[PDB]
Amino acid sequence: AGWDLTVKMLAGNEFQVSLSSSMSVSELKAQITQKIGVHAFQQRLAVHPSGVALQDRVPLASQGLGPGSTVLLVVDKCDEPLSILVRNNKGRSSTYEVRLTQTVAHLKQQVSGLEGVQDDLFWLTFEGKPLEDQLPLGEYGLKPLSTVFMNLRLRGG
C-alpha cells in the first residue's frame, strides 16, 4: 500500500506528496524538496492542526499520520555564517567559516587547502555519519563549533 499526504504552507497554499508505509520524516522532506525545491534541513514540519512535532526516524504511518491527514510546513531560509571545527589524523582542530547551504564538496576544498591533501584521499564524518560530497552541510545538522572528523582513505585493491 502507498498513500497521499497534504502539506499546508504558512503562505496558505497546499499541495500533495506520495509516500509508502516505511517512509519517515527524511523521505517526506526529500519529497517536498522535489515539489517546491527547498533543502530538507530548511523545513519545519508538524501535524496539522494538533501542531505536534514529527518523530525523526520512526515511520509516519506508525505515528498519527495516515491517508487523508495534513502536515504544516514552514520554511526557515536563514543562512547565517557559523564556525565549525575539522580535526585531522594528528588531532589539530582548525576553524572554518561556512554556511549550511554550501556543499560538503566545497568544505573539502577548504580542508584540502589548509591540510594540504588532495580532496579525494580523505572523507569527512559527523557523529559517525559519512558526509556525501554533493549534499549541503545543513543536512548533517551542524551547530556552531560542531566538530567534523577528517579520515585518511586507505586505497585497497
Binding site: S18, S21, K129, L154, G156, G157
Partner: protein
C-alpha cells in the same frame, strides 16, 4: 507477434507484461536489465519467455515497491546496482566451512574483507534488500550482496576501496539503536567528563586496535593543550570495531573475532582478512593459510561483546 515476460524492481512483486517483439525493451519499459545485463536497446529474443527483468521505477506502484525494498528513492540506484551485479555474478566465491571470500578480481580485496567481516558479526539491516542478500551471502550465494554493498556505498567495480569507509556507509543502513557506549575523558584542566554515545559511534573507534587498551585507557590530545586519558566505562553491543592507522600488530588466537590487514600506502595497497577459528586463518582472497600466531600491518579489529561495565 509477442512473448510474455515479468518486470519487477524487488524480485518480490512480479508484473506480467506482453512485449511486442518488433520494439526494443527500452521502447516499452524504459531502462531494462536481465540479471544485471542492460537489455534496454535489445529486441526481445524467444529465449526470454517467462523470465524476470528489472526496470527503472516509472510509476507510483513500482516506486512504492522499490522504496519498501531498498529504503532509497535515489533514481540512479538500480542502474549502479545492476551495473555492479553484471560483474559480481562473474566472480568466484570460495568457502572455508561456510565462510565465503572472493577470488581477487577488479581490485575487490576490500569488498572481500568487508564480506568476510559481515559474516562474523551480529548485524541486522533495515532495507529488506540488504537483509535478504545478507542471509543468502552467509549461505554462499553472495554475488548479489556484493553488488548491493557496492551500490549502497556508491562505489563501482574496479575502484580501490577502504574497509572502514565501507562498514561506516553500511552501518547507516543497520539497526544499532540498542547499542550504547559510555566513556570518561580525564583531563587535569577540564576535569572528568562522561559522554554517552548511541548507534554507529557506540561500536566504532579510530585510535587503537586493542579493545583491552581502550578499557584501561588511551592518551588523546585535548582542546586544553596537553594530554587527557579516554577510557571505556560501559559498552552494550553485539560487537565492537577498533580501527587505527596500519601498524605492525600481533593477533593472539581466541582474543578477537576477525581483523583487516593493509599492505601498501595511501595511493595503492592490498587487504587480507585474519579470523580466529580453531587456529588463525589468513584469507588473501582465494588463498588460505593457517598459523598458531600472526604478526602484520593490522588496521581494523572486530571483537565479540554483550554487556561490559568497568571496575574503576
Amino acid at each position: 507477434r509477442t512473448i510474455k515476460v515479468f518486470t519487477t524492481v524487488d524480485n518480490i512483486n512480479l508484473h506480467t507484461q506482453v512485449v511486442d517483439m518488433s520494439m526494443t525493451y527500452g521502447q516499452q519499459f524504459g531502462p531494462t536489465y536481465l540479471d544485471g545485463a542492460d537489455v534496454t536497446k535489445i529486441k526481445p529474443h524467444n529465449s526470454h519467455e517467462g523470465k524476470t527483468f528489472y526496470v527503472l521505477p516509472n510509476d507510483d506502484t513500482l516506486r512504492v515497491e522499490a522504496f519498501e525494498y531498498y529504503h532509497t528513492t535515489d533514481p540512479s540506484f538500480l542502474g549502479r546496482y545492476m551495473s555492479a551485479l553484471n560483474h559480481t555474478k562473474k566472480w568466484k566465491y570460495p568457502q572455508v566451512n561456510g565462510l565465503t571470500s572472493i577470488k581477487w578480481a577488479d581490485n575487490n580485496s576490500y569488498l572481500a574483507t568487508a564480506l568476510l567481516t559481515l559474516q562474523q558479526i551480529e548485524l541486522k539491516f533495515n532495507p529488506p534488500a540488504l537483509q535478504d542478500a545478507y542471509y543468502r551471502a552467509r549461505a554462499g550465494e553472495a554475488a548479489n550482496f556484493c553488488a548491493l554493498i557496492l551500490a549502497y556505498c556508491n562505489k563501482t567495480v574496479g575502484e580501490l576501496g577502504d574497509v572502514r569507509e565501507t562498514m561506516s556507509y553500511l552501518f547507516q543502513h543497520a539497526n544499532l539503536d540498542s547499542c550504547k557506549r559510555v566513556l570518561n575523558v580525564v583531563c587535569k584542566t577540564c576535569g572528568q567528563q562522561q559522554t554517552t554515545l548511541k548507534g554507529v559511534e557506540a561500536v566504532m573507534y579510530m585510535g587503537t586496535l586493542s579493545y583491552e587498551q581502550f578499557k584501561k585507557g588511551v592518551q588523546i590530545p585535548c582542546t586544553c593543550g596537553k594530554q587527557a586519558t579516554k577510557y571505556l566505562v560501559q559498552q552494550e553491543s553485539p560487537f565492537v570495531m577498533m580501527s587505527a592507522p596500519p601498524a605492525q600488530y600481533e593477533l593472539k588466537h581466541g582474543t578477537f573475532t576477525c581483523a583487516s590487514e593493509y599492505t601498501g600506502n595511501y595511493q595503492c595497497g592490498h587487504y587480507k582478512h585474519i579470523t580466529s577459528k580453531e587456529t588463525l586463518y589468513c584469507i588473501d582472497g582465494a588463498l588460505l593459510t593457517k598459523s598458531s600466531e600472526y604478526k602484520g600491518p593490522i588496521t581494523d579489529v572486530f571483537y565479540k561483546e554483550n554487556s561490559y561495565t568497568t571496575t574503576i
